[PDB]
Every structure is written in C-alpha cells, then in structure tokens.
C-alpha cells in the first residue's frame, strides 16, 4: 500500500523590505532554493502573512501583495501609499507518499 502523508512547513522570512521606491519584499522559491531554504518541488497550498503583525490577515492589510503557490510572495514599495511594504513571510505545504 501507499498513502499520502502531508504536513505544513515553518515560517520563512529571508529578507527585510527596504525603504524607498524600488524596495520591498521579494520572497521567491528560486531565492529560497539559492539561500539554502528547503523548497519542495511539489506542493498543495501555501500561506503568506506579515511577520510583524501575526494576527490581522493579508486582506485586512489592504496592501498590494501577490502571493501564489507557484511563485511565492512579492510586495513592491512603489505600488502602495505610503510607498512602502511591511515585513512579510510565508510557509509551504509538503506531501510525500509513504508505504502503508
């Protein structure tokens, strides 16, 4: 037999967004691989949040962040008013198949 065993990951805050116009947070799976953070090739769903505000969700922030299961998280300074971002992080879900 073979059954899927799946679990969440921990929190990954690999950058601190920079003040200015081009600044922000760019937490990408390729950057995660380069920095040595373990990146699962296959996944089901991922969760992004603000690291300094661990309660209020993303939509309650109202800031322009794009966060997707294929790429990761991106917040650009120039797209928000004031032209800044918060310090975000994210976590992923890894599932393997274990013999029964």
């Amino acid at each position: 037999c073979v059954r899927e065993v799946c679990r969440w990951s921990s929190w990954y805050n690999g950058h601190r967004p920079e003040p200015g116009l081009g600044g922000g947070d760019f937490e990408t799976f390729e950057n995660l691989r380069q920095r040595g953070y373990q990146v699962c090739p296959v996944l089901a769903d991922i969760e992004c949040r603000a690291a300094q505000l661990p309660d209020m969700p993303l939509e309650e922030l109202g800031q322009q962040v794009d966060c997707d299961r294929m790429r990761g998280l991106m917040c650009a300074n120039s797209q928000q008013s004031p032209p800044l971002c918060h310090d975000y992080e994210l976590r992923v879900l890894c599932c393997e198949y274990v013999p029964c």
Binding site: E60, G62, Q64, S78, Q79, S81, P83
Partner: protein, 368 residues
C-alpha cells in the same frame, strides 16, 4: 410614423409637426471616477487627474449637508500612476463619516462596520461582491466598485441641479462652467482645477501629463491595442451602445490605463467594466462581453456564489424573505458581479442554500 413617441432614459420625443417634440424626464446626475485618474463630472466634462491627495469629489457648496471625498494615491514609479484608495462621505457637517476603503472595508465614524447597515436613513449594502451601495436620504447615492480595482460612481436627485461644487462640477448643464473655482473664474485644465480642491494644504499639486505611457513598451502597446480595441469594434458586444454613447473617451481610458497599469489586465477590465456600467446607466444591457478576456474575474468568486451580468436588485437573503428588508427599497443602476443564483439564498452564515435549507426567523429566533 407621426403619432409615435420614443422615450430615452433622460427625455421623451414624439414624432409630430414634422419634427421631434422633445420633453425631458428628470434625470439623476452621475459623476464618476474611473481608473483612479479619469473623472466624468455631472456636466459630462471628462478630464484626467493625476493627483496624490484627498480631493473634495462633490459638495453642495451652499451648505455642508454632504461632502463626498476621494483619496487618490500614487501607485508606481511614475507620477501619473494613480489608484483610487478611499471614498469618505462626510455628512451633517462632518458629524458622520462613512469611509469605504479599497479592500472593501467600510468604516462608520472610523469604526469597522460590516454590511448591510441601515441607520439615520443611510443604507449600506453590497448588491454583489464587486460593488458597495451607500444610499442616503440627503439626495446622493454612492456606488463604489472594488473589483477589479477601485472606482466610484455618484448619483444625484436632479433637485440639486446648479447647486453643487467640488471636482464633479456644479451640475448645471453647462460644460464650460465645470472649472468654476471658488474665486469666480473658470480654470484652464484638469490638474489646475483640481489643485484648488485639495483637502490638505500639505499635498503636492497635481501636474499635467502629456507623455502617453503607451509609447514605452511595444509588448504593452500590442497587448493594450489588441484588447482595448474590443470597444470600438462594430461587431463586438459593445456596439449596442455605440449608437448612444461615443466610446472614444472610454477607448482612450483603456489605452492609458493598460499601458500605464502595472496590472494591465486589472486596469483593462476596469475600463471595460466602466464602459459597460456607463452604458447600462444610460439603459442598455450589455452582456457576455468577457469572451476570452477578464475571465479570472468569473472564476475568483466566493464559494457557493456565481457571476451574474445583470444584478438589478438587492441580494436574496433568508432573513429578508422571512421578515422583509429595508435594503431592497433602493433603486440603483444594474451592476454586474458575484451573487447567489436565483432560487437560492444566503443564510446568516453566508453560505448559499436553497429556500428549503434556510429557516424562518421570528423575533430574531432561528426557527428551522
């Protein structure tokens, strides 16, 4: 054939005397801010506004009965990259303030207030997931769009004709007086007029923009052209409104948005939604115009809901069918968006179930 008549949304004309004898039915005026930059006033004086401040969108400048404010905020590298970010209806001389943000959050007197809410004759509710209706008894109605981005529409009972001030102009059926400032002279251009209506003295004055963002990227060029050209195509769904509303300003808006917008699809679909909504305000039911375009707004609906092109009433609710509702007594232009399908209702939990699964409510008691 003489003897016949035909009534528009705004006037009725009879074929007689060898001519058209035209009388006018009263028409509620309509201001709007679309794309976060473009403004169509009550006199239909379309103009562009690239500003970063809070601007008095409209105000009955005899008194302080109502004051619709709009906060336009710069959204990118370029000074001409703006998004609407809030709509702050001040009221009773500032005693009340209903602030609709861009995420959909509604703040009653700077306090979060979910929807609907009915108090002091003010009714707030969402006909669909794309729009928020702030209906007041003072005369003005606000209809605010959140999806795909933030746009505002304002309706006035024609009684206030030739009385208002603010960005949307004095509503007196004259396009040459729209730039009347508080100093008694007609201002020259858009930004020069707007910089007299800023809320805060510390804001930076808006600047006139000649450089078309369309000239920057050739791929942005071809994308915006190939999509925004769907407006003026005589075989397109939009053709039905061409013989009523000239689509040239809307095509210019679509071009400018998509070329300048970092999220090209968002601003593109905002422009197409704006054209559709304006035409439906004039009384044409444009339908099925999202062929191969803007379908990610079909799919992203909340679960158990579904899209609808003609949403022309309140939202069918179990509480409402049980005990009536003040909400459904407001007439607004038929907007599109996500709603429960017919024959279904959303309970207090919000999930969409048929009538058989939702309970009657007596004295507020859930009666299964």
């Amino acid at each position: 054939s003489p003897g016949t008549s035909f009534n528009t949304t705004c006037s009725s004309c009879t074929c007689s005397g060898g001519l058209w004898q035209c009388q006018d039915l009263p028409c509620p005026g309509t201001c709007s801010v679309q794309g976060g930059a473009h403004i169509s006033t009550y006199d239909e004086k379309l103009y562009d506004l690239h500003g970063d401040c809070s601007y008095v969108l409209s105000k009955k400048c005899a008194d302080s009965s109502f004051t619709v404010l709009a906060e336009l905020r710069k959204c990118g590298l370029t000074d001409n990259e703006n998004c609407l970010k809030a709509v702050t209806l001040s009221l009773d001389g500032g005693d009340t303030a209903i602030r609709v943000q861009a995420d959909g959050g509604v703040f009653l007197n700077s306090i979060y207030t979910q929807l609907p809410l009915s108090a002091a004759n003010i009714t707030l509710f969402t006909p669909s997931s794309f729009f928020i209706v702030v209906q007041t008894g003072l005369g003005l109605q606000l209809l605010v769009q959140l999806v795909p981005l933030m746009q505002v529409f304002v309706r006035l009972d024609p009684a206030h004709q030739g009385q208002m001030c603010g960005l949307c102009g004095n509503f007196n059926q004259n396009q040459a007086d729209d730039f009347t400032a508080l100093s008694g002279v007609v201002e020259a251009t858009g930004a020069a007029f707007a910089n007299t209506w800023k809320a805060q003295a510390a804001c930076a004055n808006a600047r006139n923009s000649f450089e078309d963002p369309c000239s920057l990227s050739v791929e942005n060029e071809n994308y915006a052209r190939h999509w925004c050209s769907r407006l003026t195509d005589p075989n397109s769904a939009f053709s039905r409104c061409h013989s009523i509303i000239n689509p040239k300003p809307f095509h210019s808006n679509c071009m400018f948005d998509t070329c300048n917008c970092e999220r090209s699809e968002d601003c593109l679909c905002a422009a197409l939604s704006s054209y559709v909504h304006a035409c439906a305000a004039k009384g044409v039911q444009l339908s099925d115009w999202r062929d191969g375009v803007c379908t990610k707004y079909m799919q992203n609906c909340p679960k158990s809901q579904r899209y609808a092109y003609v949403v022309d009433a309140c939202q069918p609710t179990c509480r409402g069918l049980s005990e009536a509702d003040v909400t459904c007594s407001v007439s607004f232009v038929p907007v599109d968006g996500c709603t429960c399908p017919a024959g279904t209702f959303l309970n207090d939990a919000g999930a969409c179930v048929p009538a058989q699964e939702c309970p009657c409510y007596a004295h507020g008691t859930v009666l299964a």
